[PDB]
């Protein structure tokens, strides 16, 4: 599995590690300058990041009551953001994914689809991911085994014009979801964004408002240097929400506060575990709840 117990396998490392440590020292406590002091320490270990650290810190300062029980209110606000997708009146429903590679994206395409093809609606999968002949294949093997087309070209594809093909076959066909699979290498900055730009662009074509999600994936795992990257794709293209991957896999699930407060984008999903049914739709209240309880 139910909603808490993916969020406790998710949280498992980062309470064990840090916020196991954080509920202990403000339960039942008044924040004081040795609480603060050790709080401030205990954030930043934790992926919290300077600034978000610093906004719990001030915010904290505003109450006399049980800080732990303020903490609580405070993060539920810093994740108090809309996690529904922006499906549009009239299919297909055209999503891009975004992030650098190794971070989940391909396993996330992966899972959304079988997520839609089990609320009942017709998937189409596009290869853009275009260099990657393994990328490539990992998508055909996840579009056969949850039940969805997949449009692919053979490796060296323009991946505008596989994401422009995969929209015009949705299109044609009335089919209700397009998930785009996009290229991640890193070691070329101008490059990749002209890149994205191209797919972002080449969907108007088709479909004037597609895409109407634009989900960046980011991996826990990375911690800060995720968070760094992430900026990045927020300049290339206009990032709708986030797909915050492998969070049992770290204790840095922190960085999920990091990443709300400091980027302003909703977070969507989180993925925990290799399952298909580890991707699941972001919950911020439960999410508080385990990650602060006793
Ligand atoms: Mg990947």
Same mark, same amino acid.
């Given at each position: 599995?139910?909603?808490?117990?993916?969020?406790?396998?998710?949280?498992?490392?980062?309470?064990?590690?840090?916020?196991?440590?954080?509920?202990?020292?403000?339960?039942?406590?008044?924040?004081?300058?040795?609480?603060?002091?050790?709080?401030?320490?205990?954030?930043?270990?934790?992926?919290?990041?300077?600034?978000?650290?610093?906004?719990?810190?001030?915010?904290?300062?505003?109450?006399?009551?049980?800080?732990?029980?303020?903490?609580?209110? +405070? @993060?539920?606000?810093?994740?108090?953001?809309? $996690? /529904?997708? *922006?499906?549009?009146? =009239?299919?297909?429903? #055209?999503?891009? &994914?975004?992030?650098?590679?190794?971070?989940?994206?391909?396993?996330?395409?992966?899972?959304?689809?079988?997520?839609?093809?089990?609320?009942?609606?017709?998937?189409?999968?596009?290869?853009?991911?275009?260099?990657?002949?393994?990328?490539?294949?990992?998508?055909?093997?996840?579009?056969?085994?949850?039940?969805?087309?997949?449009?692919?070209?053979?490796?060296?594809?323009?991946?505008?014009?596989?994401?422009?093909?995969?929209?015009?076959?949705?299109?044609?066909?009335?089919?209700?979801?397009? +998930? @785009?699979?996009?290229?991640?290498?890193?070691? $070329? /900055?101008? *490059?990749?964004?002209? =890149?994205?730009?191209? #797919?972002?662009? &080449?969907?108007?074509?088709?479909?004037?408002?597609?895409?109407?999600?634009?989900?960046?994936?980011?991996?826990?795992?990375?911690?800060?240097?995720?968070?760094?990257?992430?900026?990045?794709?927020?300049?290339?293209?206009?990032?709708?929400?986030?797909?915050?991957?492998?969070?049992?896999?770290?204790?840095?699930?922190?960085?999920?506060?990091?990443?709300?407060?400091?980027?302003?984008?909703?977070?969507?999903?989180?993925?925990?575990?290799?399952?298909?049914?580890?991707?699941?739709?972001?919950?911020?209240?439960?999410?508080?709840?385990?990650?602060?309880?006793?």
């Amino acid at each position: 599995m139910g909603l808490f117990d993916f969020l406790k396998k998710g949280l498992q490392k980062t309470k064990e590690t840090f916020f196991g440590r954080v509920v202990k020292l403000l339960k039942g406590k008044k924040l004081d300058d040795e609480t603060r002091e050790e709080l401030e320490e205990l954030l930043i270990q934790a992926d919290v990041g300077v600034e978000t650290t610093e906004y719990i810190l001030e915010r904290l300062e505003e109450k006399d009551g049980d800080a732990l029980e303020s903490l609580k209110e +405070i @993060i539920l606000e810093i994740l108090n953001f809309d $996690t /529904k997708l *922006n499906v549009p009146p =009239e299919p297909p429903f #055209v999503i891009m &994914v975004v992030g650098v590679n190794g971070t989940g994206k391909t396993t996330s395409c992966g899972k959304l689809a079988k997520m839609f093809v089990d609320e009942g609606k017709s998937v189409v999968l596009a290869a853009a991911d275009t260099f990657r002949a393994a990328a490539i294949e990992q998508l055909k093997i996840w579009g056969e085994r949850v039940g969805a087309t997949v449009i692919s070209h053979s490796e060296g594809a323009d991946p505008a014009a596989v994401a422009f093909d995969a929209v015009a076959h949705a299109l044609a066909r009335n089919k209700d979801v397009v +998930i @785009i699979d996009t290229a991640g290498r890193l070691h $070329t /900055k101008k *490059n990749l964004m002209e =890149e994205l730009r191209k #797919v972002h662009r &080449v969907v108007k074509k088709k479909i004037p408002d597609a895409p109407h999600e634009t989900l960046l994936v980011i991996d826990a795992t990375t911690g800060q240097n995720g968070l760094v990257q992430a900026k990045i794709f927020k300049e290339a293209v206009n990032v709708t929400g986030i797909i915050l991957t492998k969070l049992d896999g770290t204790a840095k699930g922190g960085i999920t506060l990091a990443i709300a407060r400091e980027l302003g984008i909703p977070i969507k999903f989180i993925g925990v575990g290799e399952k298909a049914e580890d991707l699941r739709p972001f919950d911020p209240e439960a999410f508080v709840e385990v990650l602060l309880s006793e």
